[PDB]
Amino acid sequence: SSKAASLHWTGERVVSVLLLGLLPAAYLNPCSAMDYSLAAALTLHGHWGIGQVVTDYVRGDALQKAAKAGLLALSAFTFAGLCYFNYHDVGICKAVAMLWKL
Amino acid sequence: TTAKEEMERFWNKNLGSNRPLSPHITIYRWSLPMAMSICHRGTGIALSAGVSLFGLSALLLPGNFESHLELVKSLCLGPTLIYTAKFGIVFPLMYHTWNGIRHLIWDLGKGLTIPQLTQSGVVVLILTVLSSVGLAAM
Amino acid sequence: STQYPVVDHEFDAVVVGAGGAGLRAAFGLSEAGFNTACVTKLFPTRSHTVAAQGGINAALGNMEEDNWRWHFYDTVKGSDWLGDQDAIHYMTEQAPASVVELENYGMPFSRTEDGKIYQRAFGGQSLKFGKGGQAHRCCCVADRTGHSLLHTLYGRSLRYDTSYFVEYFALDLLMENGECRGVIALCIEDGSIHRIRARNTVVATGGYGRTYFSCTSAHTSTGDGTAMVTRAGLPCQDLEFVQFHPTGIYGAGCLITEGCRGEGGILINSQGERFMERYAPVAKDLASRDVVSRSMTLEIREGRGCGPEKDHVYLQLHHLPPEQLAVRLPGISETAMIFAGVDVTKEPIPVLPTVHYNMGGIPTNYKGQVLRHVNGQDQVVPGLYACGEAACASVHGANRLGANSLLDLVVFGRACALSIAESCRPGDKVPSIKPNAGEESVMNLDKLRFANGTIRTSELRLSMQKSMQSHAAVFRVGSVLQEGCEKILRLYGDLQHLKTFDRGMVWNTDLVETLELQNLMLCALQTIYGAEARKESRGAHAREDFKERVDEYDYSKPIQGQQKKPFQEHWRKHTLSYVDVKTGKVSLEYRPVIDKTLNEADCATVPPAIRSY
Amino acid sequence: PRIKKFAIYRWDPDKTGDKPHMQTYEIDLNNCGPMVLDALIKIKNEIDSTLTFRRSCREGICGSCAMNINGGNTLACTRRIDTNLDKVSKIYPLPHMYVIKDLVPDLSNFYAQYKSIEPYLKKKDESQEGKQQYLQSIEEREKLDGLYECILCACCSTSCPSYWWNGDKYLGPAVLMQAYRWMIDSRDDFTEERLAKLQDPFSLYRCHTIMNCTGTCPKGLNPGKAIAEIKKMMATYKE
């Protein structure tokens, strides 16, 4: 029937292999286009990451929903900042490069 | 009786009882895969905490990235002490990267036996020490 | 009355036991539409039929051409003509129908090139009415047949609306004016006493193999349902007949399947010779269960001991292919490695004759009905049934054939359902018991609750086990049984002097052991007194004083000009045993064996003969 | 003579104000059987008949003895006693389980989860049941090897951390393996809907491949592997 939970499981693997493929790609081809894709994959895999953690340890009819939203806000605020960083600042790729030769 | 009713009757009996829970984390034997699964969750949580705090302070703190980098040089930490901070970042990142590959191989259905769990597990652990040193001095 | 909390349950039919027999009887009733209860002291899957490894006999004909009438002959021949042929007819006739039914439940039988159920050789079977060599009709799930038989039936039982009383030790039958109304059962969980009344009752508690020291049977084979029948004053049949499985580990006494002998494995002595060829050369080490162990026990005494104490024999599987002991026999390959510490591939396995099967039990009409002995005849106890090893339809008689017990359950568990579904209807007037009845079961329980004395409950069991093992073993003489009989009667006097320790209500495993001990003694006294009474050598029962097979005729020459022996002159009759609970006194009667079939024209009566494999 | 010390978990619900406490028993390994259960029986029959546990087959197929000996969940009738006399063997009930009394865990929840997956052959044609044997090839019977052998001892589920925390919504390895057993079974016609009964965040997807279940299995089965096999089918199945 309606493949809901199985598709989300696949979705986590799809972004995980993508993120695995993007760490050497950002190193070999550092550009302001690879900057955003890294921010996209880093936050999505991170959101579905902590998602599993919350649905595991947190038990509650009322406490579960608040954490789902509390995480969603924190993820949106994370992804927004990285896109702001890739626009109005140095940008992840060049930013790490600067940090490493310190 | 239905399966649901049996499960419902269990909890009503046991939550309102004097029965004690048997120990689990106190008594259970430690193993490499079991301890390596904990560190993967640890490195996951710790890695997202850094990623979140990096983008979060991009909107909440004044100045560009260069001004913050010049602020680091103000403390002028030693080459060995700055290497420790450099090693401290990559170590959880690489452990979670390599063990992630091991996890993704399991999703294909390969390497799911007891001898293989210890083998590929040690391979990840060794690849973590070498890649992290190979990147801390990069 | 309100000292112990009483919960009066009401059902159409109760089944006491969750093994292959009780489980099949349980869900078979529900399938027809009966509000069925299932009282069991263990979880259904954790019964005994789990330990079954050999297989399940059925003339399906998958390796060869096969007739079920050949299997009919094979069984009665093995039963030493103490088997009731009307019951043996019904079984072998339904064998191909019952197994196909099990495969249709999903039971993963081993397969062949054609895709049909795998069949292989087993001890006691033969094609063409005992002429056409070795027969392969033993259906098997690769050395774990019974486990898979119990799991697939249990899974199927959830497909129905049966009530399951998991971990409920049943005490006594709810009897009123010769009529069974159900059972009075102690809930192990909390110590609450329940009365599960019904219009009918099925008793399938299996064997009492724990009366002996060395047995293959589980710690729960304590003949509980047999005792429930005995305490009501109802007879017990053929209790002295005990099957000794030839192949079983010398240490703990665990079973090594007859499938090991069926695949090609040979029994070897300390000398090295194929010794079963020296005894019975026609079938060799794949002969009758009683005869093979008869040879083994004799071989130990002559001086052919294979151990440091010289008290065991070897079973050889070295000569068979190493990867054949992985496809066909993987279960015995592991259990011999764990217990004996012996590789099956390059080393033979230590084997010793141990108590295995109980063909005796509760007298049964082929329909599954429990019979009592009224006026030297057969009268039915209304609303009381028995199926499986607990029962005694004497489909096995004097010796059970190779892998016929797993057939016993599925067929006679089926019969108990069908015989209720044809006699009465669901929702019919469930007869009401007295508001007091069952009081003496509770009072017996309550006296044991604070049981104070000298002899420990555990110690008395150990004093009973060695008394049976030394006296009523494989071979038994008159004089050794006479001292053995008064020795068991001595131990029955030590039931008020017994000491119990745990005095709680929840999970009192100390209390149920004493209840099991009561049931074990009630099974022991009739196994021993019945054995000393029988003055002949028949099947598993072998008297050294009387090695004669005493029948109504001497079957050496034709029954032409021979005088028919009176009923109390011969021994080709069922041993019916009673026992007074208050003094431990054993009284015993005898009833005729059934020689006729269900249809003479379709299935021929097999006349008695000098049987030797 | 040889002395062996056993640290056994004890509890009595009938004694008022009693809380879980350990108890020591000393056993001569010379006058006792080679297995843990042989000791547990001995300390009950001779030493103290207050001890409670589940025993039956004493050979390792009934699954009554499921307990935590020395950190791992195996059958007490199969695990042999540590001949190292300078150690005290720790005996506990199955981890994170309600203890009815003394080493006896309430598995009624565990059994109910087994009922929910419906472990029986389901055909689209119930009309021909009990007259013809369904043809299954030997190579299709191979796929069932390692799955039918399950004892339902529960040693694997009760070792799973995820089953500890979420022992209500998550089915666990013992049960999930059986759901797989009926998925690849050649005869079974209801397989898509068997996979559909797992389309929720807990049923199947609370496994994180910790693999602690496989390591502790008494019969050497691989429930973790089988769980991972189900996961793939959920991503592939169509219509």
Ligand SMILES: *Cc1cc2c(cc1C)nc1c(=O)[nH]c(=O)nc-1n2C[C@H](O)[C@H](O)[C@H](O)COP(=O)(O)OP(=O)(O)OC[C@H]1O[C@@H](n2cnc3c(N)ncnc32)[C@H](O)[C@@H]1O
């Ligand atoms: C012991 C044995 C038997 C055996 C075998 C191997 C071993 C070690 N291998 C066999 C084989 O390969 N092929 C075959 O045909 N038979 C084999 N057998 C014999 C056979 O499998 C069994 O011995 C026989 O089928 C017994 O089955 P049955 O259904 O009659 O009962 P059970 O399996 O022994 O289980 C007993 C049930 O009764 C309940 N019970 C007992 N007492 C009570 C009380 N007090 N109150 C409530 N319930 C009670 C138990 O709970 C149990 O479910």
Ligand code: HEM
């Ligand atoms: C490119 C390298 C990476 C790979 C190959 C990878 C792989 C994986 C996989 C497959 C999982 C699934 C969890 C499981 O079922 O066990 C996971 C968990 C997780 N990952 Fe990553 N990951 C990577 C990088 C990152 C990064 C950079 C972060 C930080 C933002 C992160 C955060 C998390 C979190 C929070 C979890 C949850 C832990 C859990 O579910 O048990 N990952 N990782």
Ligand SMILES: O=C(Nc1cccc(-c2ccccc2)c1)c1ccccc1I
């Ligand atoms: O909670 C998890 N394990 C956990 C958490 C806390 C303690 C123990 C543990 C420690 C020692 C012995 C046994 C278990 C195990 C966990 C870890 C990784 C992925 C998913 C999970 I649900």
Ligand code: SF4
């Ligand atoms: S898979 Fe193994 S550990 Fe799990 S319940 Fe079955 S036999 Fe026990």
Ligand code: F3S
């Ligand atoms: S069952 Fe639990 S122990 Fe395992 S493979 Fe899934 S995490």
Ligand code: FES
């Ligand atoms: S008692 Fe049967 S498994 Fe240990």
